Amino acid sequence: AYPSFEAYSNYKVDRTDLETFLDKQKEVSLYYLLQNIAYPEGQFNNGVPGTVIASPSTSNPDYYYQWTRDSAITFLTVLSELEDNNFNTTLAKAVEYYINTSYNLQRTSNPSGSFDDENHKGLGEPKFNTDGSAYTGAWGRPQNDGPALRAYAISRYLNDVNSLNEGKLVLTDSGDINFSSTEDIYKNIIKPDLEYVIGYWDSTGFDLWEENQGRHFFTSLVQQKALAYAVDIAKSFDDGDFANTLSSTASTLESYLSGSDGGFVNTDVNHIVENPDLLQQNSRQGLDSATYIGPLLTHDIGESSSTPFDVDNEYVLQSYYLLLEDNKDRYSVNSAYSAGAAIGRYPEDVYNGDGSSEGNPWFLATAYAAQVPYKLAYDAKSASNDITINKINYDFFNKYIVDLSTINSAYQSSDSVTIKSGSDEFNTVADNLVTFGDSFLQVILDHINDDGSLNEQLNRYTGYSTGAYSLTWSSGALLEAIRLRNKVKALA
Template sequence: MVQIRFSIITIALGVVSINAQISTWVANETSISYAKMYNNIQPAGTAAGCVIASPSISNPDYYYSWVRDSAMTLKVVINQYNTTSASNSTLLSIIKNYVTFSRNTQTESTPCSCIGEPKFNVDGSAYTGAWGRPQNDGPAIRATALIKFAYSYIAQTGDKSYVLSALYDGKLPTSTIIKADLEYVSNNWRSVCYDLWEEVEGNHFFTMMVQRRSLIEGAAFATYMDDTGAANYYSEQAADILTALKTFWNLEAGTIETTQNYTQGVKYKSSGLDCAQILGVLHGYAGDGQFSPNNDELLSTAYNLKQKFASLYPVNYNNSSYATAIGRYPEDEYDGTGTSEGNPWILCTAAYAELYSKAAMQYDIDGAIYVTANNLNFIKQFYSSASSGDVYSSSSSQYTTIVNGLYSGADGFFETISYHANTDGSLGEEWDRTTGYNVGAHDLTWSYASFITASLARSGTPAF
């Protein structure tokens, strides 16, 4: 087990909260989530740098290293190294081990013969069983995380040689992890792949969002590393991805579509609603105003999805005193061990808490709230007199009411997580839609990472 002194990474809850009790619980659960997340990073019996999805080895068996889940987790680790735990040698060792493990998987012979191979055995060898492959979101998220690390590592240590030898060498063919990921993303983003839920092959909003961000930040990093030709190419591809992303908006349905160009996979996702769109913005927003956390199309999607789950799950309509527990998508049939009826997911509910906090912060950056036909229903949750066309400046009472409502709404989702969490603070994958008890994989690493990033957003110090 990795030993981290959590006293040096305790977050400060900086936003105003009307609920001191939930503030105390969030702070405590954040410490628990850090500890339990680290339990799943290179545990005994796994290769150095391996991040397991869960210790669960049966019903379901998640004792593997998923590229996407691992990259989501390392975002949290790297955020600590870059901020509250700068120069921490234990964190640095974990990150470097992850780099080595991941680079080895990039060069491993795999069934898809590509960097989009979705998961590996805990010793780093290829998983060769049947699976939905390729999945092209993981390399993009990994590149984004390691670019943030590379900048910080150079700033903290002055050691650019490690970056050149292990992270980005600017060569083709490359022997470095970030360069390999960026080349894969930039040359394959148009290709169909499986989605983050590993069920549908096509072109996906979530995947393209994280790919675009990786290429925007990759272009800046390539310039920093004097690889200007690659920087130009990455920028060109990012611009083309944005054009494609804008076609996902379905005005009639009031939602951002999940997938285009379906080729195979489950066929029952008829509503077009999916938490993947929320996650896509949380992990794929590049800070350039395109598909920001307060984007009116995204907020319309978030509202419609939440309303659907409010009336779908008994844990919601039988217990309306708590905020809506959020699942993956309404038609979901995966129940944690097999197929029957889908359930609320912890990481999806935490994503809503993070979205609400980040939307409030983005309004503060913008200095005003613009009410449109798209975001009207979402805004009216907090200010019922809102009308399309209204503009509320940051000095207005309407603005204050809405922003405070967003922070209170985020706390509501934390209260829902608190209500359903195990008594020891452990977080699994799902809650049974009727009983509310944890089901599916226990101690899901992504659940802990998602809770931590939601907590950081609540504190006013969001992870990248």
């Protein structure tokens, strides 16, 4: 049951036209995203302001909780909307309420620990109840991606306040808020999460799927990004010694991510191994949609990101191709798709959205899979950068994008093919990347509920929606796909 849910009234998806669907859904999915955020001006005006529910599903399954990860990822979508529009003050108020609630949750003792523990050990706690109290039941704790994604989101709001709102906050003359300046947010809310990541990046915790403990590519990547991005924030508040702590730590984590201690880059299999400890146990072989979701979250197109493992990395793109090819054979629903297809979490998954049997494809994974080729095209065309295709990725490009012997007849004798910006083949490759990305959004249009809401999962046989209803992260993933598609279609 999902008692709180309110459909977008008298809307029904049009399944006959992708273009019309994406134009309309841009508004519809934002309505469903904002419905799950408490803020006085919103639909969810009875919750504690700044609370993000993962889903209105309160049973079968029960996802009516606030997780640090889903709240942060939700607000990266809110931030993109704030950046693209006029620093809309309604949306900015919602971000400041989330910053305030985040301050309170940081200071809430829970089963992971408390704020006064070494390097604020309680900040690894994955989820809290909707009234802001601790979740005391057994859970896969800690999860060390959450404080990194929260630190990145709130850092990014400070950069936008400085650049779009002349350095001013929107909730300054309010008595309900626990900060009165950008420096207060940095010292009191951003720094404590970056201290957590400095203290605990080389420590064991649970992955983003909340299932296994050990080394995880996504977790380390989103930590590296939070630290790197915060360097210039810290400098701006005259926190120079901490800036250089962050710089040094970010470089150290970069080396860990790309070396044999981390174990994620596996040149025996030539793809990323998302969870290397489960490869040692022989329990999973390493393919996971988290391998390309992390790259996408950590390289927003509106930044000039230094951080490693963008989606043009050969081992990330090989994990993406090999998961695609797995899922096209694995899920019967995908028999009528010849390009993109419905994608799940990892090939070994047994979670069926409300128990264990056989895993299913996920709407969020499918929406991120559209973003991979959209970003490859956008990064080339927007900047007039050449496209360089490494030999490990030739099979992917020949099967789905372009025949590489039509570009260079001797390509199999070289280690890479470089397609030059401006050339006719470059325009073909970029348009074919976009059309490939659209094929994943066509899968979503085939199987979305008629009311425009997105569940967590779609059944592997039929494609009918299943699991948690109107999952906030699903809505967000589709909104970011539509955003990237409109940005690259505006260049042609």
